[PDB]
Structure 1
Amino acid sequence: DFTQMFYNQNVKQFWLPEEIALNGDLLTWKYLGKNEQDTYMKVLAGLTLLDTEQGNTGMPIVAEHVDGHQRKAVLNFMAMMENAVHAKSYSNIFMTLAPTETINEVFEWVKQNKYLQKKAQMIVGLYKAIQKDDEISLFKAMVASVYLESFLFYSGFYYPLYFYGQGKLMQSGEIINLILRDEAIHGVYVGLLAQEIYNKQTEEKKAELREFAIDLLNQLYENELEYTEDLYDQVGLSHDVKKFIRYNANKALMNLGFDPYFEEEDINPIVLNGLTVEPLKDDDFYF
């Protein structure tokens, strides 16, 4: 009942980072403190890693196991967006704002950062555990994918949105909003596929799947807290970002057909502001 409308929405949202000129951010970037620039680079690098694996591994593997040519076409399109559009856009931003050495250093930093490695290990592990014709392993990977789309990106998205909302780094911010617009529909779509599998189960099996989903969310959440503190303490925003990731965790659960898990909190209002041809016939010449 939904794939065709998602197909149409995905293809109509198609974009390339080159459509957005980035030289306009040069001055507002120059004006940020060293702490702010450091957090910003690292945040986008963490996002780049997530999209790299979502494009290389997550979306293609889910596409392989989901039945139906139209469902596969949507998932293939989403995969392309992840690595050919999203992951690449971050390099466009980096190449504009930062010198090569700072770019090299931040990519080295992703490799050695323990929270980023842990979250990649956990998510990619679940993708690679999918067994052919085994719907339960597929469900588990789809939960992981929804958590990546609708929860994990948001510790990263906070900062570009926070600046966009203050009228700073608005070209980079425009790119990020386009990425976010895509991930929102990706999270909903994968969520609907996960619910299909969940709804086939006995009540006993469903109870276990909810346990899996909640245990996984909590494990990812605890790691994301440490990641958030590590990045944001130097810019004074860790508590604010934490509220934002909890907000988005609830959206991820909802995408999976589950009740919200965290209590509602006031999000920084700055971040909220950050959000034919037909031929002419002979009679056409007479009136």
Structure 2
Amino acid sequence: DFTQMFYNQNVKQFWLPEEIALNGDLLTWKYLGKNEQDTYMKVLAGLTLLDTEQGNTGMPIVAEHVDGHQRKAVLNFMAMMENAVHAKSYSNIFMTLAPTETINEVFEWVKQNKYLQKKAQMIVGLYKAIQKDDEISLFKAMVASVYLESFLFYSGFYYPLYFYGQGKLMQSGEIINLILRDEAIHGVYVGLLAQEIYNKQTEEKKAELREFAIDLLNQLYENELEYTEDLYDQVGLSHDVKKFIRYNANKALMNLGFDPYFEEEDINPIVLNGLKATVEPLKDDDFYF
């Protein structure tokens, strides 16, 4: 009911890194404090590292196990955007703002970081556990994928959106907004594929899959809180970032056809400013009574 519509929306959102000139960001970058520059670098590396997993494994593995030519095509398009567009865009932002040696060090740090690694490996673990012709394991991986696309990225997106909403780092903020807009539709689409599997299950199996999804969300959420304090306490933003994480967790759940887990909260206004039963023929004698 939905793949051709998503095909259309995906291809009409096509864009390339070269379209946004990045050099003019140096005119606001130079005015940020060390903590602001440090947080931005770390957040950016976090997003880059997670998005690489999605391009190399997450999207291609789902495309491999999903049946249907049109779905495989949409999924291929999404994988292309991760690898050919998003990855180049993140690299471009980095090369503009930091010298080569600084980029290498930030990636070394974020690569060793406990909270980034915990979530990255949790997601990758579920992708590696998909078994051929087993729709339960596929569903679990789709849940992981939706959580990455619609939830885990947002502790990171917060900061570029925060600057973007203030008139700072506008070129890289525009790029991030385009990336985020792609991840939103990726999350919604994979969510619909997960609901299709979920709806084919018994009531007991459904309850079991719901428990899986909520348990996974809880593990990721508790790590996000730690990740958030680790990055944002030094710039005084953690309270507001936490509200943004919960709001996006609720969107991820709704993508999977589940109820919101967290109470509704208002979001930081600066970040907001940045943001067929069965056909049977009539065989006569049905017109007579």
TM-score normalized by structure 1?
A: 0.95
Q: What's the CA shift for 1:239?
A: 0.8
Q: What's the CA shift for 1:284?
A: 58
CA distance in 1, matches of 2:189, 2:288: 52
Pick closer, same or farther for the CA change 1:285–1:101 going to 2, 3 Å. farther
For the aligned residue pairs, the C-alpha RMSD in angstroms reads 9.3
What corresponds to 2:19 in structure 1? 19
Q: What's the CA shift for 1:84?
A: 1.6
Residue 211 of structure 2 is aligned to residue 211 of structure 1:
yes
Q: What's the CA shift for 1:280?
A: 52
4+ residue stretches of structure 1 with deviation over 4 A? 276-287
Q: What's the CA shift for 1:277?
A: 43
Q: What's the CA shift for 1:69?
A: 1.0
What corresponds to 1:195 in structure 2? 195
Pick closer, same or farther for the CA change 1:201–1:25 going to 2, 3 Å. same
CA distance in 2, matches of 1:280, 1:20: 61
CA distance in 2, matches of 1:124, 1:221: 17
Q: What's the CA shift for 1:267?
A: 0.9
Pick closer, same or farther for the CA change 1:223–1:285 going to 2, 3 Å. closer
CA displacement, residues 6-58 of structure 1 (integer Å, 9 cap, x when unaligned): 11111111111111000111110010000000000100100001110000000
CA displacement, residues 86-123 of structure 1 (integer Å, 9 cap, x when unaligned): 12211100111111111111110121001111111100
CA distance in 1, matches of 2:145, 2:197: 14
Pick closer, same or farther for the CA change 1:34–1:136 going to 2, 3 Å. same
What corresponds to 1:228 in structure 2? 228
CA distance in 2, matches of 1:285, 1:37: 78
Instruction: Between 268-277 and 104-113, report the one with greater CA deviation.
Output: 268-277
- Any idea what SS the aligned residue of 1:281 has? coil
Pick closer, same or farther for the CA change 1:42–1:134 going to 2, 3 Å. same
Pick closer, same or farther for the CA change 1:277–1:91 going to 2, 3 Å. farther
What residue ranges of structure 1 are gaps of 5+ in the alignment?
Answer: none
Pick closer, same or farther for the CA change 1:99–1:278 going to 2, 3 Å. farther
Pick closer, same or farther for the CA change 1:23–1:66 going to 2, 3 Å. same
TM-score normalized by structure 2?
A: 0.94
How many residues get paired? 287
CA distance in 2, matches of 1:133, 1:277: 29
Q: What's the CA shift for 1:283?
A: 59
CA displacement, residues 239-264 of structure 1 (integer Å, 9 cap, x when unaligned): 11000000000000000000000011
